[PDB]
Design an enzyme around this catalytic site. Structure first.
Site, PDB file in Angstrom:
ATOM      1  N   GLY A  18       0.775  -1.247   0.000  1.00  0.00           N
ATOM      2  CA  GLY A  18       0.000   0.000   0.000  1.00  0.00           C
ATOM      3  C   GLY A  18       0.808   1.300   0.000  1.00  0.00           C
ATOM      4  O   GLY A  18       2.044   1.280   0.119  1.00  0.00           O
ATOM      5  N   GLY A  20       1.205   5.555   1.303  1.00  0.00           N
ATOM      6  CA  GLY A  20       0.870   6.484   2.371  1.00  0.00           C
ATOM      7  C   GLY A  20       1.144   7.922   2.012  1.00  0.00           C
ATOM      8  O   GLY A  20       0.932   8.341   0.860  1.00  0.00           O
ATOM      9  N   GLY A  23       5.322   7.580   0.655  1.00  0.00           N
ATOM     10  CA  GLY A  23       6.061   6.371   0.320  1.00  0.00           C
ATOM     11  C   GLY A  23       5.166   5.271  -0.158  1.00  0.00           C
ATOM     12  O   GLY A  23       3.990   5.232   0.212  1.00  0.00           O
ATOM     13  N   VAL A  25       5.049   0.955  -0.168  1.00  0.00           N
ATOM     14  CA  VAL A  25       5.614  -0.120   0.615  1.00  0.00           C
ATOM     15  C   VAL A  25       5.395  -1.498  -0.017  1.00  0.00           C
ATOM     16  O   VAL A  25       4.258  -1.861  -0.361  1.00  0.00           O
ATOM     17  CB  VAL A  25       4.944  -0.102   1.988  1.00  0.00           C
ATOM     18  N   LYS A  40       9.998   0.344   1.845  1.00  0.00           N
ATOM     19  CA  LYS A  40       9.234   1.528   1.571  1.00  0.00           C
ATOM     20  C   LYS A  40      10.031   2.392   0.609  1.00  0.00           C
ATOM     21  O   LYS A  40      11.221   2.722   0.885  1.00  0.00           O
ATOM     22  CB  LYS A  40       8.974   2.176   2.905  1.00  0.00           C
ATOM     23  N   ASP A 133       4.754  10.779  14.858  1.00  0.00           N
ATOM     24  CA  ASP A 133       3.537  10.459  14.145  1.00  0.00           C
ATOM     25  C   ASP A 133       2.840   9.175  14.668  1.00  0.00           C
ATOM     26  O   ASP A 133       2.597   8.212  13.914  1.00  0.00           O
ATOM     27  CB  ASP A 133       3.786  10.444  12.623  1.00  0.00           C
ATOM     28  N   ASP A 160      12.418  16.985   7.551  1.00  0.00           N
ATOM     29  CA  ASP A 160      12.438  18.193   6.730  1.00  0.00           C
ATOM     30  C   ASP A 160      11.994  18.033   5.288  1.00  0.00           C
ATOM     31  O   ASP A 160      11.056  18.705   4.858  1.00  0.00           O
ATOM     32  CB  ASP A 160      13.746  18.936   6.834  1.00  0.00           C
TER      33      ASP A 160
HETATM   34  N1  LIG Z   1       7.042  -3.205   7.966  1.00  0.00           N
HETATM   35  C1  LIG Z   1       5.818  -3.332   7.420  1.00  0.00           C
HETATM   36  N2  LIG Z   1       5.213  -4.538   7.306  1.00  0.00           N
HETATM   37  C2  LIG Z   1       4.012  -4.691   6.758  1.00  0.00           C
HETATM   38  N3  LIG Z   1       3.287  -3.647   6.313  1.00  0.00           N
HETATM   39  C3  LIG Z   1       3.772  -2.384   6.381  1.00  0.00           C
HETATM   40  C4  LIG Z   1       5.099  -2.145   6.942  1.00  0.00           C
HETATM   41  N4  LIG Z   1       5.339  -0.829   6.893  1.00  0.00           N
HETATM   42  C5  LIG Z   1       4.234  -0.283   6.353  1.00  0.00           C
HETATM   43  N5  LIG Z   1       3.303  -1.203   6.032  1.00  0.00           N
HETATM   44  C6  LIG Z   1       1.975  -0.982   5.439  1.00  0.00           C
HETATM   45  O1  LIG Z   1       2.022  -0.389   4.144  1.00  0.00           O
HETATM   46  C7  LIG Z   1       0.922   0.541   3.969  1.00  0.00           C
HETATM   47  C8  LIG Z   1       1.498   1.917   3.596  1.00  0.00           C
HETATM   48  O2  LIG Z   1       2.460   2.340   4.570  1.00  0.00           O
HETATM   49  P1  LIG Z   1       2.771   3.893   4.783  1.00  0.00           P
HETATM   50  O3  LIG Z   1       3.578   4.176   6.016  1.00  0.00           O
HETATM   51  O4  LIG Z   1       3.319   4.403   3.472  1.00  0.00           O
HETATM   52  O5  LIG Z   1       1.264   4.456   4.926  1.00  0.00           O
HETATM   53  P2  LIG Z   1       0.496   4.882   6.259  1.00  0.00           P
HETATM   54  O6  LIG Z   1      -0.785   4.091   6.098  1.00  0.00           O
HETATM   55  O7  LIG Z   1       1.248   4.506   7.515  1.00  0.00           O
HETATM   56  C9  LIG Z   1       0.326   6.708   6.242  1.00  0.00           C
HETATM   57  P3  LIG Z   1       1.928   7.539   6.594  1.00  0.00           P
HETATM   58  O8  LIG Z   1       2.640   7.547   5.257  1.00  0.00           O
HETATM   59  O9  LIG Z   1       1.745   8.955   7.104  1.00  0.00           O
HETATM   60  O10 LIG Z   1       2.689   6.723   7.657  1.00  0.00           O
HETATM   61  C10 LIG Z   1       0.214   0.619   5.320  1.00  0.00           C
HETATM   62  O11 LIG Z   1      -0.958  -0.219   5.381  1.00  0.00           O
HETATM   63  C11 LIG Z   1       1.231   0.061   6.268  1.00  0.00           C
HETATM   64  O12 LIG Z   1       0.568  -0.533   7.373  1.00  0.00           O
HETATM   65  O1  LIG Z   2       8.153   7.024   6.449  1.00  0.00           O
HETATM   66  C1  LIG Z   2       8.158   7.944   7.258  1.00  0.00           C
HETATM   67  C2  LIG Z   2       9.428   8.434   7.875  1.00  0.00           C
HETATM   68  C3  LIG Z   2       9.575   9.829   8.179  1.00  0.00           C
HETATM   69  C4  LIG Z   2      10.771  10.321   8.726  1.00  0.00           C
HETATM   70  C5  LIG Z   2      11.795   9.380   8.940  1.00  0.00           C
HETATM   71  F1  LIG Z   2      12.980   9.590   9.450  1.00  0.00           F
HETATM   72  C6  LIG Z   2      11.660   8.051   8.619  1.00  0.00           C
HETATM   73  F2  LIG Z   2      12.648   7.247   8.899  1.00  0.00           F
HETATM   74  C7  LIG Z   2      10.501   7.540   8.082  1.00  0.00           C
HETATM   75  N1  LIG Z   2      10.497   6.177   7.865  1.00  0.00           N
HETATM   76  C8  LIG Z   2      10.830   5.074   8.669  1.00  0.00           C
HETATM   77  C9  LIG Z   2      11.341   5.246   9.980  1.00  0.00           C
HETATM   78  C10 LIG Z   2      11.667   4.121  10.787  1.00  0.00           C
HETATM   79  C11 LIG Z   2      11.458   2.831  10.293  1.00  0.00           C
HETATM   80  I1  LIG Z   2      11.934   1.014  11.416  1.00  0.00           I
HETATM   81  C12 LIG Z   2      10.955   2.668   9.018  1.00  0.00           C
HETATM   82  C13 LIG Z   2      10.635   3.776   8.203  1.00  0.00           C
HETATM   83  F3  LIG Z   2      10.159   3.581   6.968  1.00  0.00           F
HETATM   84  N2  LIG Z   2       6.970   8.497   7.566  1.00  0.00           N
HETATM   85  C14 LIG Z   2       6.630   9.530   8.531  1.00  0.00           C
HETATM   86  C15 LIG Z   2       5.178   9.168   8.005  1.00  0.00           C
HETATM   87  O2  LIG Z   2       4.393   8.437   8.950  1.00  0.00           O
HETATM   88  C16 LIG Z   2       4.331  10.278   7.389  1.00  0.00           C
HETATM   89  C17 LIG Z   2       5.181  11.301   6.577  1.00  0.00           C
HETATM   90  C18 LIG Z   2       4.325  12.551   6.297  1.00  0.00           C
HETATM   91  C19 LIG Z   2       3.926  13.215   7.641  1.00  0.00           C
HETATM   92  C20 LIG Z   2       3.090  12.192   8.448  1.00  0.00           C
HETATM   93  N3  LIG Z   2       3.733  10.869   8.596  1.00  0.00           N
HETATM   94  C21 LIG Z   2       5.695   8.096   6.981  1.00  0.00           C
HETATM   95 MG   LIG Z   3       3.172   4.718   7.954  1.00  0.00          MG
END
Ligand SMILES: Nc1ncnc2c1ncn2[C@@H]1O[C@H](COP(=O)(O)OP(=O)(O)CP(=O)(O)O)[C@@H](O)[C@H]1O
Ligand SMILES: O=C(c1ccc(F)c(F)c1Nc1ccc(I)cc1F)N1CC(O)([C@@H]2CCCCN2)C1
Ligand SMILES: [Mg+2]
Length: 282
Positions: A18, A20, A23, A25, A40, A133, A160
């Site tokens: 999916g 977000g 990114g 993933v 991601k 977050d 940033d």
């Molecule tokens: N390590 C992991 N294992 C399995 N699924 C993961 C994962 N990391 C992320 N996902 C899933 O991939 C989908 C997209 O992740 P992403 O972080 O891009 O979106 P999000 O739904 O958390 C909004 P945000 O981008 O603000 O965090 C989500 O359903 C998330 O739960």
């Molecule tokens: O993917 C991220 C994210 C943002 C900042 C950062 F330093 C990261 F490392 C991020 N990814 C990340 C961190 C630790 C692990 I283990 C795995 C990762 F992929 N974000 C922040 C996010 O939740 C969104 C970005 C837009 C503002 C709201 N939240 C998605």
């Molecule tokens: Mg997320």
């Protein structure tokens, strides 16, 4: 180093997981080591200087070692998309769980609080990193019943680079933070409280309203509260303690770790893995 050599040609898609706020993933196979991983990809638009800083700053994830923090394998730049490689979690997130379940029960949520409390304490005490977050979709679960924090703010530059393309989850921000104050430690706790309410009631817990109206509502109106009949008073109290608007008065992690809700939750035998199957069918 465990892998050292991370490159695009060695991974192999098993599925989209999916999209977000910035990114996409995937579940991938990492051919040369047999490791299963989530990956991601974040498209940006930046000078090779910034790009490479970001990749340097992310290396600090190699030192996150906790049962409450999703595991780090590596990060690299490729084909204009930066890659974060992490432990795959076969439950997805509580937000996927919630969609599936309708509403997540108070006991499972006790387990969730313990993991989250402890996830944040780890990040903050070992690495001095704030999450920034906390929300159902940044909390992951797996068939082994485990519950973990991902997507926290390791990299000051990536925050940033992500802030001036998105200040994404406005709706999960603390009143102080909507007001312009700098990120407190106390902000992660707000967001936790709000996430538990949301999972407890099964819906973002605020009157439905237009987004900018929401942001004034949050600074100006009182915090959310659990429906006061269906949930234990421990849970309600817990939640209210996370949700004090004034960050000086809000509870912190030391104080929440000893709360009656946590003590009680800690002693219960909750087969969460099993419930996850009951509910998401693995
Ligand atoms: N390590 C992991 N294992 C399995 N699924 C993961 C994962 N990391 C992320 N996902 C899933 O991939 C989908 C997209 O992740 P992403 O972080 O891009 O979106 P999000 O739904 O958390 C909004 P945000 O981008 O603000 O965090 C989500 O359903 C998330 O739960
Ligand atoms: O993917 C991220 C994210 C943002 C900042 C950062 F330093 C990261 F490392 C991020 N990814 C990340 C961190 C630790 C692990 I283990 C795995 C990762 F992929 N974000 C922040 C996010 O939740 C969104 C970005 C837009 C503002 C709201 N939240 C998605
Ligand atoms: Mg997320």
């Amino acid at each position: 180093m465990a892998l050292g050599e991370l490159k695009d040609d060695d991974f192999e898609k098993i599925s989209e997981l999916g999209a977000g706020n910035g990114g996409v993933v995937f579940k991938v196979s990492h051919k040369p080591s047999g490791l299963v991983m989530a990956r991601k990809l974040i498209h940006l638009e930046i000078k090779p200087a910034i790009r490479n800083q970001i990749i340097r700053e992310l290396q600090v994830l190699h030192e996150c070692n906790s049962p409450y923090i999703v595991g780090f394998y590596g990060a690299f730049y490729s084909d204009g998309e930066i890659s974060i490689c992490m432990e795959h979690m076969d439950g997805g997130s509580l937000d996927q769980v919630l969609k599936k379940a309708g509403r997540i029960p108070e006991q499972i949520l006790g387990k969730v609080s313990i993991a989250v409390i402890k996830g944040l304490t780890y990040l903050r005490e070992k690495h001095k990193i704030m999450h920034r977050d906390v929300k159902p979709s940044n909390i992951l679960v797996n068939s082994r019943g485990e519950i973990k924090l991902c997507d926290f703010g390791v990299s000051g530059q990536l925050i940033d680079e992500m802030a001036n393309e998105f200040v994404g989850t406005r709706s999960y921000m603390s009143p102080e933070r909507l007001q312009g104050t700098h990120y407190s430690v106390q902000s992660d706790i707000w967001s936790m409280g709000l996430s538990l309410v949301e999972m407890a009631v099964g819906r973002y817990p605020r009157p439905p309203m237009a987004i900018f109206e929401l942001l004034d509502y949050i600074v100006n109106e009182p915090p959310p509260k659990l429906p006061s009949a269906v949930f234990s008073l421990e849970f309600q109290d817990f939640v209210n303690k996370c949700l004090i608007k004034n960050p000086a008065e809000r509870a912190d992690l030391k104080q929440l770790m000893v709360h009656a809700f946590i003590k009680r939750s800690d002693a219960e035998e909750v087969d969460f893995a099993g419930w996850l199957c009951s509910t998401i069918g693995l």
